[PDB]
DNA sequence: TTATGTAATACGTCTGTAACTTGTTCTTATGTCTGTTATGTAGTTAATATAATTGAAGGATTTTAAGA
């Protein structure tokens, strides 16, 4: 499964790599491999789309086994925003009292 | 003997948690202004009428000022 984001950002879940490319089959500028919980968060954001994911479910998915301090949620999002160079918060948007949504240009299956 | 290659071990270290902190954004409690009704104040009334008032009660002794 291949995911396109704004600004020609391509994420490959099978190989789990994110990079800049005009052609999905030909990486141009490699960003690299996100961490594990980063992959979980990305998959959650891509798996409720078009609808956003409620905070309780992402909380229960990122750290299911132990209830974690709340800040970690937001902090994890920061890194998932930062690794995908989403400085303008255009890849992860936050809808108040609704959750977190991701922007997908297209999916290649 | 000495290269070699595994293995213990100690130290960086990349990343996941969490603390400190601010934006800002929304909600609510409060202080204030304004309009209406109830309260509080005040002035006037034109047959004539012209020295209260109500009790209350078997006290027994002292000392001290006024009156003569």
From TrEMBL:
Q: Mind listing where the DNA-binding region sits, in residue ranges?
A: 1-104
> Domain OmpR/PhoB-type: where?
1-104
Entry protein name:
Toxin co-regulated pilus biosynthesis protein P
Species in which this protein is naturally found: Vibrio cholerae serotype O1 (strain ATCC 39541 / Classical Ogawa 395 / O395)
What lineage is this protein's organism placed in?
Bacteria, Pseudomonadati, Pseudomonadota, Gammaproteobacteria, Vibrionales
Q: Which residues of the full protein are shown?
A: 6 to 114 of 221
